[PDB]
């Protein structure tokens, strides 16, 4: 007795997503010691799997970036990036805003031009 | 598409190790015995340890040297510094050019020249000298490795269509496998080429690193003048799955190797290893319309023993089959029958050798469960073994038992739970056990087709019980054997071992008997009793062993009074020591009666007075020789109101002293945070009487929170000279212990202390005063004073006046150790640390691990030698680069002051120095 | 045939260490110069250095002679169907020592 | 889903577990390890 | 007898996507 | 026989070659017994 | 980029074979001469 | 050295090589290759 029922399925109408909500948010901890600076930007609610280059943009907003401060990292499966970087203080002198961007490659690259920025 | 790419992609894992090391020693002693012991008993981590912790052989970090690149184990006796350093180990030369190694401080005692070898005077006088100095020339090592891991998504298999007379649909069953595979570049040091198939490394099989040159090590490196290094790539894999199951609801068929199955005890206790390669079918009829409420189940087994194996093996051409059927007609009573057979085929009957029976055919039934407020456990078996040879003369052997008792989930019988409960607490007669046993003499693991078992697990502990947790022999009752003196070579005198223990010849006699253990719970009173008689299978009283007993307890308010009577009447030989102290085999009669009263004021304190009187073979027997432990029903009571449990086992370690003479640390355990000296008992039943106060800190509403002491006094009976009937309670023991942890401020103190003033040699402790004290301090980092210092500390003193029949020697020890760690030192993320340790010892020694489960220990010896182990260990750290430096010295003088350390006999201590630079890096 | 890597393994980060204490870890990033890949066959000048000197002594191994079928014409690991098999080696060169 | 959207799902489940199920929902996945991306692309009663 | 095999064959779906399908209870 | 996809195959065969007298030369150790062959297999095809 | 990744990617193909076999003979004769011949002249498939 | 004679009567071994002489090592210099083949029952798992 192989009770068998064949049912055609309907194409649905409600296809809302299910996973990390892209809601950028976080904090920064720039800590000076003996002429060196250690910056830790823990972000949450980011893209689930994405490289997030972050550097120090100088004042000028546009402004150049002291690229000797590029902190690179990728996110997890919920969207948690932890940028960490060591930069001489004399280098980061005259910096204005730590701008986080998106990374086209693990070698760096600025896919996006500022998904989140903090005044320093 | 990205998931598809990731499923079958490689994760590249490179590894780099960087480190500098130099080490110079002259004797290669051990320093891990100076470091503090953690609360779990492990020794504190250091950068100089050789490792070597093995649980199988009892090896520890304190059994091996820590200098050079050598891990030379410490040697007991004078060759080593009495277990403190490496052995002398002269080398002996021979005439034919061959050589041997003599392990001793005097080559003249080389009493073992082989049959034809003669000492050629090639060395000093034919004896060389193995240099005791080890060197690690300073170098910086970079090690590079690479592996390729897989995604790990290949954990499933789906069946495919098959068949010849027909064709199965396919894709019907999904099996979860346990295959772990990847790519490696280089071979492990323990790899080998298995040319026999045994799965084990025989005598020098291949040394796989030697088969594939350039795989690993330093002996061979496949290089290139340009500097490139080439390493072969291997596919490594483990297959943990050997069983495949098919079918879901009623019927499940499992095919695989080393099938593990279990019909019952005495028939197919074939789990824990499995028997061979084949299949098993299980049919569950718990959903059948007419009869499904009884949960009918059928099991069927077919297989070939050990799969395919070479001749002369017990499993060559031998195949087994079986079928069992069971149900649960009532609440939990499961009843089952089973047929089992194992036999040789035409290729096993010939060209098999061994002794496997030509055929074994066992039938059986079992009735385990719990139905109507009682728990029944029955078993019957019939063997019908066909003993190969030519005439055979088939031999039958049965095994029947019927028990009313509580079996645990691991199939061990719990005799502390009644399983009868014929009343409530006010009137609570409880039956604990009621069993009969008719195991035959010829019933072994061959009779019922099992792997092991059906024999006394101890022969000194409860010897009617075959339950063996080691080999998974789940069987309540054992095939008893009769023991007698061997007298193998000599005539007129019984054969003895080197230690003096007797050598016995064991003949299986089987087992037949009955036993009842019950307890009646009154109100403020409780009583209990037990009886047990077991003979041989034939029933001859020449092998009878009867144990009977009974206890009565009355507990009210804060007072408890117990009285116990125990007997043991063993016409069965039994091996035990007599009054003089020589092992013998012969019948025994033991009569014990103990009246012990206890009072618990409730403030965490406790008092206890006892009078225990043993009587072995009619004489007063200062100490029973372990005979009372031959029975499995002992069932003493326990102090306290509302504690009317009749638990098996005579609590002979109650309110009495400890007789320990071994310790992990140099001092007598008073400096070990994993040893509670106030809870150390002897576990030997004495003819004595005494009192013992105390205090427990874990009990709430106690005077001091974490405080335990066990002051006590006792008097022990001793016969007149050695074996006289007359005697007196002349022995006297006064003991005391204390332990107090506390935490004053940021520091964490810990005090321990022990004392003893024994007058006689009780178990192994000599007769003399014995004291010990120990203090351990561990301050947490100070955040007020600069540098955030974090201190440590350790002190321990041990004294003992051993008055042995050969001397009156004093054996004392003193251990100390201090150390400060600066967590903030000048530059950021910079740490410094220094620790100084020391251990002085009078006539004490260390006995290394024996290669078995037993570990090494510090003990007292009359060696007129004083050891002075000392050392300093400085560990600094920059950001993550660790500089470790260590200088240690071991000197063992004699009374004169000859300074035997560094045993080239130049009056210099053994010395060890090490310097390491460590740097952990990750990709 | 050769198998090259992405070349993205040019960094190492330190890990926590110490016995009397425990360093934080992830404190220093070191740039290394490791060049590695997979090769199928050995060069002509490869050899088995059995002494550690790093140089080819008198007839050390002739690595193509140790692993037959690696290269050359003296040995070729074949198959009647025409398949040719060559051992796969993990080649690497480390230029970083500080 | 093959290469033209020809996804063919199959699976065995004891009827006892199935009880009280009302609709077989098909979702998209984030990986072959289960996970939920879309919440109901196609579905039918029973 | 007591197990349930279910073959949901879908077509016109997304070229190389994963399609996890299960049984959602009344809720 | 075959359960879902597990195939149990069993086979027993006998070959006897007699002469006119009936000497039964099969199994040519000359003991008057036929040659005999028995096989048992359990087959299971699985795919990843 | 996915096509570039797939161009030089390995497909990992693992294989597992599980099977039980026992066979006992005294002369090792042939049994394929007993099985039916197919319309193409081939003999019927068997597990022996 | 040893050779293999393919026949039901070893006496007809008309091919002893140039210098070889039959040593009475077996029955009378002629052995007998066992005609029985055995495959001891086992379950095999092969992984590739
Ligand atoms: C769906 C599949 C249908 C069945 C397929 C066809 C097979 C049946 C036809 C008759 C075929 C079976 C006839 C029984 C031969 N006898 C055997 O048991 C022998 C046992 O070996 C040796 O043992 C010794 C002591 O033990 C002595 O006796 C030796 O003298 C003997 N060796 C010898 O000299 C060789 C005779 O095994 P074997 O080496 O011949 O192995 C194969 C056997 C037989 O195979 C099966 O048929 C099992 C199928 C079970 C599937 C159960 C799974 C069900 C799934 C829903 O397998 C067994 O173990 C079972 C024992 C017999 C019971 C059969 C009834 C279920
Ligand atoms: C869910 C289902 C699961 C399926 C898997 C389980 C399979 C269960 C199989 C049950 C078959 C019935 C068993 C009958 C028991 C008889 C009780 C019994 O075992 N007898 C004992 C033993 O017997 C010998 C045996 O007898 P046997 O009848 O077992 O074997 C015949 C046949 C095997 O065929 C082949 C392959 O040749 O097996 C069947 C039944 O098919 C035999 O003749 N072998 C010749 C060789 C002799 C040495 C083993 O002789 C004596 C000792 O030498 C003595 O000790 C006896 O007490
Ligand atoms: C039929 C059929 C079908 O065609 C369509 C569709 O219905 C199905 C597919 C479901 C189907 C298949 C049905 C299938 C599932 C088979 C039924 C399941 C049962 C389980 C089979 C076995 C039943 C036998 C039973 C288990 C034996 C009971 C006897 C006891 C063991 C006796 C013990 C007594 C002991 C000795 C006392 C103790 C004595 C001592 C001295 C030891 O103390
Ligand atoms: Cu050590
Ligand atoms: Cu075998
Ligand atoms: Cu077991
Ligand atoms: Fe081996
Ligand atoms: Fe060299």
């Amino acid at each position: 007795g192989p009770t068998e029922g064949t049912y055609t399925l309907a194409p649905q109408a409600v296809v809302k997503p299910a996973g990390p909500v892209y809601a950028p948010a976080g904090t920064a901890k720039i800590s000076e010691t003996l002429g060196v600076t250690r910056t830790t930007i823990t972000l949450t609610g980011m893209a689930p799997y994405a490289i997030y280059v972050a550097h120090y943009h100088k004042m000028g907003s546009d402004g150049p970036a002291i690229m000797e401060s590029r902190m690179i990292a990728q996110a997890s499966a919920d969207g948690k990036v932890t940028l960490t970087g060591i930069v001489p203080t004399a280098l980061i002198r005259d910096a204005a805003y730590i701008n986080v961007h998106h990374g086209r490659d693990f070698s760096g690259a600025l896919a996006d031009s500022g998904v989140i920025c903090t005044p320093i | 598409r990205i998931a598809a790419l990731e499923r079958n992609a490689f994760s590249v894992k490179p590894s780099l190790t960087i480190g500098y090391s130099v080490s110079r020693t002259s004797r290669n002693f051990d320093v891990d015995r100076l470091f503090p012991l953690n609360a779990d008993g492990t020794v504190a981590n250091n950068a100089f340890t050789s490792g070597g912790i093995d649980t199988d052989t009892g090896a520890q970090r304190r059994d091996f040297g820590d200098f050079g690149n050598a891990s030379d184990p410490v040697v007991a006796g004078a060759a080593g510094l009495y277990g403190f350093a490496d052995g002398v180990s002269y080398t002996v030369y021979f005439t034919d050019g061959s050589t041997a190694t003599f392990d001793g401080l005097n080559p003249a005692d080389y009493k073992v020249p082989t049959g034809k070898v003669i000492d050629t005077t090639k060395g000093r006088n034919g004896f060389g000298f193995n240099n005791l100095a080890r060197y690690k020339e300073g170098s910086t090592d970079i090690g590079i490795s690479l592996g390729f891991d897989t995604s790990g998504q290949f954990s499933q298999v789906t069946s495919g269509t098959g068949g010849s007379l027909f064709s199965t649909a396919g894709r019907l069953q999904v099996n979860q496998i346990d295959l772990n595979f990847g790519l490696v570049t280089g071979l492990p040091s323990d790899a080998y080429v298995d040319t026999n198939g045994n799965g084990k490394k025989d005598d020098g099989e291949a040394t796989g690193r030697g088969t594939y040159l350039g795989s690993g090590g330093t002996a061979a490196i496949l290089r290139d003048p340009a500097g490139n290094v080439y390493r072969p790539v291997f596919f490594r894999f483990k297959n943990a799955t050997t069983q495949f199951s098919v079918g879901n609801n009623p019927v499940i068929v499992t095919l695989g190797q080393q099938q593990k199955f279990y019909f019952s005890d005495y028939v197919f206790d074939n789990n824990y290893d499995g028997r061979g390669d084949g299949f098993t079918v299980t049919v569950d009829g718990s959903n059948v319309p007419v009869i499904g409420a009884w949960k009918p189940q059928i099991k069927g087994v077919y297989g070939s023993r050990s799969g395919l194996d070479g001749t002369a093996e017990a499993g060559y051409g031998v195949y087994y089959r079986g079928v069992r059927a069971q149900i649960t007609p009532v609440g939990t009573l499961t009843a089952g029958i089973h047929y089992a057979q194992e036999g040789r085929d035409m290729f096993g009957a010939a060209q098999n050798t061994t002794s496997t029976p030509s055929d074994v055919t066992t039938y059986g039934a079992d009735l385990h469960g719990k139905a109507f407020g009682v728990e029944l456990h029955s078993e019957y078996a019939t063997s019908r073994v066909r003993p190969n040879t030519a005439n055979a003369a088939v031999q039958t052997s049965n095994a029947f038992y019927a028990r009313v008792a509580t079996r645990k989930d691991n199939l061990a019988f719990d005799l502390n739970t009644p399983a009868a409960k014929f009343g409530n607490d006010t009137f609570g007669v409880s039956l604990y056990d009621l069993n009969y046993r008719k195991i035959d003499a010829g019933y072994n693991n061959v009779a019922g087709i099992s792997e092991y078992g059906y024999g006394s697990y101890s022969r000194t502990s409860a010897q009617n019980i075959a339950y063996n947790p080691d080999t998974g022999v789940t069987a309540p009752f054992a095939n008893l054997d009769r023991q007698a003196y061997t007298d193998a070579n000599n005539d007129g005198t019984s054969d003895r071992n080197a230690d003096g223990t007797v050598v016995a010849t064991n003949t299986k006699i089987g087992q037949m008997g009955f036993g009842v253990k019950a307890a009646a719970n009154l109100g403020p009173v409780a009583i209990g009793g037990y009886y047990d008689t077991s003979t041989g299978a034939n029933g001859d009283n020449a092998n009878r062993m009867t144990e009977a007993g009974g206890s009565a307890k009355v507990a009210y308010s804060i007072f408890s009074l117990r009285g116990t009577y125990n007997t043991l009447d063993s016409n069965r030989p039994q091996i035990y020591r007599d009054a003089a102290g020589t092992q013998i085999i012969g019948d025994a009669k033991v009569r014990r009666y103990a009246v012990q009263a206890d009072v618990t004021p409730g403030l965490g304190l406790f008092v206890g007075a006892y009078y225990r009187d043993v009587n072995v073979n009619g004489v007063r027997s200062t100490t029973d020789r372990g005979l009372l432990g031959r029975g499995y029903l002992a069932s003493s009571f326990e102090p306290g109101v509302g504690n009317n449990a009749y638990r098996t086992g005579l609590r002979c370690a109650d309110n009495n002293f400890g007789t320990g003479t071994r310790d992990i640390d140099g001092v007598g355990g008073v400096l070990n945070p994993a040893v509670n000296l106030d809870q150390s008992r002897t576990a030997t039943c004495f003819t004595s009487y005494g009192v013992e106060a105390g205090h427990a800190g874990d009990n709430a509403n106690a005077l001091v929170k974490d405080l335990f002491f066990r002051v006590g006094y006792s008097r022990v009976y001793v016969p007149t000279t050695a074996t006289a009937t007359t005697g007196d309670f002349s022995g006297s023991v006064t003991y005391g212990d204390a332990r107090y942890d506390r935490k004053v401020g940021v520091a964490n103190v810990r005090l321990a202390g022990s004392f003893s003033t024994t007058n006689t040699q009780l178990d192994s402790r000599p007769a003399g005063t014995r004291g010990a004290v120990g203090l351990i301090v561990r301050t947490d980092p100070l955040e007020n004073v600069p540098f955030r210092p974090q201190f440590n500390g350790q002190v321990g003193y041990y004294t003992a006046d051993n008055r042995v029949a050969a001397g009156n020697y004093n054996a004392n020890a003193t251990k100390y150790g201090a150390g400060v760690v600066l967590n903030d030192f000048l530059l950021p993320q910079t740490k410094i640390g220094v620790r100084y340790d020391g251990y002085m010892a009078q006539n004490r020694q260390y006995t290394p691990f024996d290669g078995d489960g037993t570990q090494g220990y510090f003990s007292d010896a009359n060696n007129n030698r004083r050891t002075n182990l000392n050392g300093v260990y400085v560990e600094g750290a920059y950001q993550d680069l660790i500089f470790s430096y260590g200088t240690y010295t071991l000197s063992q003088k004699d009374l004169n002051g000859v300074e035997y350390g560094s045993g080239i006999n130049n009056g210099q201590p053994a010395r060890g120095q090490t310097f390491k630079i460590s740097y952990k890096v990750n990709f």
Side-chain angles (χ1 to χ4, degrees), chain A, chain B residues 1-95 97-104 106-923:
Chain A
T3 299
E4 200 270 318
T6 299
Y7 318 130
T8 299
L9 305 110
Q12 272 275 0
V14 175
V15 296
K16 64 179 180 180
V21 184
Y22 185 54
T27 177
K29 292 182 292 297
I30 169 169
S31 64
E32 203 267 317
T33 189
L34 284 179
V36 296
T37 57
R38 293 182 183 174
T39 59
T40 315
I41 295 100
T42 299
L43 292 155
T44 49
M46 310 306 281
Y49 297 94
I51 294 169
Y52 271 98
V53 184
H55 31 75
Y56 281 74
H57 264 270
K58 320 184 50 75
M59 183 176 282
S61 64
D62 181 65
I66 294 169
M67 292 177 72
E68 302 223 41
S69 82
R70 292 181 295 103
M71 293 183 284
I72 294 169
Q74 213 184 2
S76 64
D78 189 78
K80 293 179 179 179
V81 175
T82 315
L83 305 162
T84 299
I86 186 167
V87 197
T89 312
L91 263 64
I92 52 112
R93 293 182 183 174
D94 310 305
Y97 64 103
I98 280 190
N99 203 2
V100 175
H101 306 256
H102 267 117
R104 291 193 297 274
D105 271 287
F106 296 97
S107 64
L110 290 199
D112 286 14
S113 295
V115 295
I116 197 138
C117 61
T118 174
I120 80 98
Chain B
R1 297 180 75 203
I2 290 166
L5 273 170
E6 292 176 350
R7 181 171 190 272
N8 61 8
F10 282 129
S11 53
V12 180
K13 292 183 179 293
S15 298
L16 179 73
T17 75
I18 192 66
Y20 173 87
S21 66
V22 64
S23 178
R24 326 175 178 80
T25 195
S26 63
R27 184 65 185 270
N28 203 12
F29 56 106
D30 176 77
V31 299
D32 297 299
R33 74 198 37 199
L34 288 167
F35 285 80
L37 296 164
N38 296 125
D40 63 358
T42 61
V43 60
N45 280 313
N46 48 320
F48 309 133
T49 178
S50 306
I53 291 169
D54 196 1
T55 305
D56 309 72
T57 68
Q60 300 281 315
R61 278 163 45 187
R62 77 181 170 266
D63 288 323
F64 309 96
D66 306 319
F67 300 105
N69 271 325
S71 69
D72 308 310
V74 294
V75 170
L81 295 181
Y82 282 105
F84 274 86
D86 194 31
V88 162
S89 192
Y90 287 77
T91 176
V92 305
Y93 298 110
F94 286 155
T95 58
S98 180
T99 60
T101 61
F102 169 54
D103 304 354
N106 208 312
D109 299 0
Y110 182 47
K111 302 290 94 175
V112 192
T114 73
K116 58 94 178 175
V117 301
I118 306 96
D119 298 356
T120 298
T121 310
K122 299 198 291 181
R124 187 250 192 279
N125 268 348
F127 307 113
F129 193 108
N130 297 299
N131 193 26
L132 282 170
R134 316 286 177 245
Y135 188 41
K136 204 282 167 189
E137 204 191 331
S139 75
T140 294
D141 302 312
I142 297 89
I144 291 170
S145 66
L146 182 82
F148 304 98
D149 281 330
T150 74
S151 66
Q153 281 173 50
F154 307 90
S155 173
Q156 268 200 0
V157 287
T158 317
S159 46
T161 184
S164 302
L165 296 187
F166 50 64
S167 192
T168 56
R171 298 291 183 184
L172 286 173
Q173 173 82 26
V174 173
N175 280 122
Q176 311 294 142
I177 62 169
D178 195 352
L179 182 64
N180 188 359
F181 62 91
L183 298 170
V184 301
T185 63
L187 284 172
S189 65
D190 50 343
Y192 58 97
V193 178
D194 200 38
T195 58
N196 308 354
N198 50 3
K200 67 181 178 67
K201 181 175 168 64
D202 291 332
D203 291 333
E205 277 277 333
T207 302
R209 270 187 178 172
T211 313
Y212 287 93
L213 270 65
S215 305
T218 50
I221 297 168
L222 180 58
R223 287 202 68 261
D224 206 349
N228 292 316
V229 180
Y230 308 91
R231 288 202 194 126
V233 173
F234 297 92
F235 158 71
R236 177 212 57 82
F237 77 93
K238 293 187 286 185
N239 191 39
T241 297
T242 46
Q243 317 276 300
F244 293 80
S245 302
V246 168
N248 304 114
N249 170 50
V251 180
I252 298 163
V253 185
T254 302
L255 170 69
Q257 307 168 346
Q258 277 295 132
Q259 302 281 98
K260 292 176 187 176
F261 40 97
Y262 175 84
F263 276 5
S264 87
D265 43 11
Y266 298 116
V267 167
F268 281 172
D269 201 352
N270 273 287
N271 46 11
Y272 181 76
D273 263 343
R275 196 157 202 78
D277 303 351
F279 75 88
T280 68
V281 187
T282 311
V283 190
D284 170 57
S286 71
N287 294 117
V288 183
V290 293
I291 192 165
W294 285 12
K295 316 191 262 283
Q297 199 208 80
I298 284 168
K299 293 193 286 184
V301 184
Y302 161 81
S304 173
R305 259 187 80 173
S306 305
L308 64 89
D309 57 6
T311 309
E313 297 197 45
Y316 180 83
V318 61
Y319 301 80
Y320 58 89
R321 78 175 91 167
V323 59
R324 172 179 166 78
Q326 76 177 3
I327 62 169
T328 300
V330 296
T332 318
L333 260 179
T334 306
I337 62 168
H338 48 271
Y339 168 85
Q341 181 167 7
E342 174 147 283
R344 283 189 208 208
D345 69 345
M346 65 182 179
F347 289 93
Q351 65 182 357
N352 179 24
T353 79
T354 48
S355 50
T356 310
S358 165
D359 195 71
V360 186
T361 308
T362 310
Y363 305 82
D366 65 63
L367 185 65
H368 316 289
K370 184 199 296 179
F372 284 122
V374 308
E375 193 159 359
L376 277 296
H377 296 282
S378 185
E379 178 92 30
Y380 182 68
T382 300
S383 187
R384 301 259 315 159
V385 168
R386 182 67 178 172
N388 213 12
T389 66
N391 185 60
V394 162
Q395 46 205 53
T396 309
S397 55
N398 317 317
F400 169 75
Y401 86 88
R403 212 173 184 164
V404 181
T406 312
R407 182 177 292 171
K408 291 192 283 289
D409 283 321
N410 60 98
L411 291 204
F413 277 94
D414 184 357
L415 308 186
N416 302 347
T417 303
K421 293 182 183 293
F422 296 131
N424 79 302
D425 278 333
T426 304
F427 163 66
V429 55
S430 307
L431 190 61
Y432 280 100
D433 194 10
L434 177 62
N435 64 17
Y436 180 75
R437 322 177 281 266
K438 186 57 176 69
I439 297 89
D440 270 347
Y443 205 101
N444 62 311
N445 70 307
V446 172
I449 312 159
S450 295
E451 320 194 327
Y452 319 89
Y454 311 113
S456 293
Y457 175 56
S458 295
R459 271 186 290 185
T460 61
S461 190
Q463 68 176 359
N464 294 337
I465 311 287
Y467 184 83
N468 191 320
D470 301 337
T471 53
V473 176
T474 289
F477 302 121
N479 198 330
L480 299 161
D481 52 25
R482 174 161 179 100
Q483 286 168 345
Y485 291 115
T486 301
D487 187 61
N489 57 6
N490 51 6
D491 295 342
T493 190
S494 299
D495 186 74
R496 298 294 182 101
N497 288 292
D499 57 32
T501 55
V502 311
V503 175
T505 70
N506 312 309
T507 72
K508 285 310 199 170
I509 60 170
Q511 178 171 182
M512 180 179 73
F514 61 98
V516 61
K517 168 193 169 188
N521 176 56
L522 277 296
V525 193
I527 72 187
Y530 66 92
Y531 187 75
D532 180 85
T533 76
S534 76
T535 309
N538 61 13
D540 170 35
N541 280 321
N543 297 299
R544 183 162 297 275
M545 183 179 73
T546 298
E547 66 183 1
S551 69
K553 171 173 110 189
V554 57
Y556 175 58
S557 189
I558 57 148
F559 313 97
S560 179
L561 172 71
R562 301 176 270 148
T564 318
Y565 184 64
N566 306 131
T567 72
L568 178 86
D569 291 331
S570 159
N571 304 334
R572 173 142 66 247
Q574 308 299 118
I575 291 175
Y576 69 109
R577 311 246 165 189
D578 48 16
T582 61
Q583 264 204 355
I584 65 169
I585 303 170
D587 63 358
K589 291 188 296 298
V590 187
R591 306 277 192 272
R592 194 197 84 150
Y593 65 84
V595 293
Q596 47 196 352
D598 291 331
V599 62
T600 186
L603 202 60
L605 304 191
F606 68 90
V607 181
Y610 64 91
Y611 173 90
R612 292 189 296 271
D613 181 285
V614 187
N615 188 359
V616 167
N617 279 311
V619 194
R620 190 84 90 100
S621 186
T622 183
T623 183
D624 184 74
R625 295 77 185 258
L627 297 162
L628 282 176
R630 300 292 200 278
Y632 65 107
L633 309 174
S635 309
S636 77
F637 268 117
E638 167 151 333
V641 185
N643 212 8
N644 315 310
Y646 203 51
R647 297 183 209 71
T648 52
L650 299 180
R651 312 145 47 81
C652 297
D654 274 6
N655 289 317
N656 74 347
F657 36 84
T659 52
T661 47
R662 312 160 167 206
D663 63 358
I664 301 299
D665 58 348
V667 304
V670 75
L671 197 63
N672 191 340
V675 173
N676 315 316
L677 291 181
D678 58 88
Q679 287 165 8
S680 174
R681 315 290 185 176
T682 180
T684 297
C685 64
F686 284 107
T687 293
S688 68
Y689 69 87
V691 62
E692 191 193 75
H695 174 67
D698 45 45
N699 171 221
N701 295 112
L703 282 168
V704 191
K705 181 69 176 177
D706 303 281
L707 179 59
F708 314 81
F709 56 87
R710 196 192 62 182
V711 60
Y713 179 69
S714 176
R715 295 191 67 85
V716 184
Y717 169 92
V718 291
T720 300
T721 58
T723 56
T725 300
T726 48
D728 184 22
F729 282 84
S730 74
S732 182
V733 189
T734 308
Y735 51 100
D737 291 331
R739 171 158 55 92
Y740 187 10
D741 305 330
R742 186 61 182 266
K743 167 161 161 92
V744 177
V746 64
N748 196 358
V749 187
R750 199 257 189 185
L751 266 165
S754 301
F755 183 65
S756 295
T757 303
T758 313
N759 176 22
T760 57
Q761 188 274 331
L762 300 165
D763 279 349
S764 56
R765 192 172 275 192
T769 311
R770 188 185 186 280
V773 65
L775 172 67
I776 306 174
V777 187
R778 292 183 291 113
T779 288
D780 276 353
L782 273 66
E783 268 94 349
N784 176 311
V785 61
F787 298 120
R788 277 182 50 226
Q790 190 199 10
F791 300 89
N792 296 115
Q794 210 196 34
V795 177
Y797 190 51
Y798 165 84
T799 313
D801 291 331
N802 305 285
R803 313 172 95 80
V804 292
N808 296 115
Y809 68 103
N810 190 359
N812 54 18
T814 313
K815 177 182 270 192
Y816 55 81
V820 65
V821 173
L822 305 184
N823 298 280
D824 273 24
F825 198 48
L826 314 177
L827 299 164
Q829 300 285 31
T830 295
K831 293 174 171 60
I832 194 73
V834 63
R835 179 184 200 51
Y836 176 71
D837 307 297
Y839 178 62
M840 294 182 286
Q842 214 156 6
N843 311 123
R844 298 197 98 233
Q845 68 171 357
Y846 176 80
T847 315
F849 69 107
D850 65 321
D852 312 330
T854 309
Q855 299 180 356
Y857 51 90
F858 290 83
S859 290
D860 293 341
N862 208 347
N863 53 356
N864 301 296
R865 283 195 193 185
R866 186 179 295 275
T867 310
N868 210 318
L869 194 44
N870 292 296
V872 58
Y873 168 32
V874 182
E875 190 165 73
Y878 202 46
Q879 276 163 20
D880 269 307
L881 194 65
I882 298 97
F883 303 84
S884 311
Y885 181 83
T887 46
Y888 299 81
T889 186
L890 167 65
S891 73
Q892 206 169 61
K893 296 180 182 179
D894 74 33
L895 267 192
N896 306 318
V898 176
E899 180 58 78
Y900 294 75
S902 184
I904 53 183
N905 293 295
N906 55 4
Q908 290 296 115
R911 287 176 218 264
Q913 183 253 346
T914 307
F915 175 55
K916 283 177 62 173
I917 315 174
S918 299
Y919 193 51
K920 181 69 176 177
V921 290
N922 314 124
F923 271 88

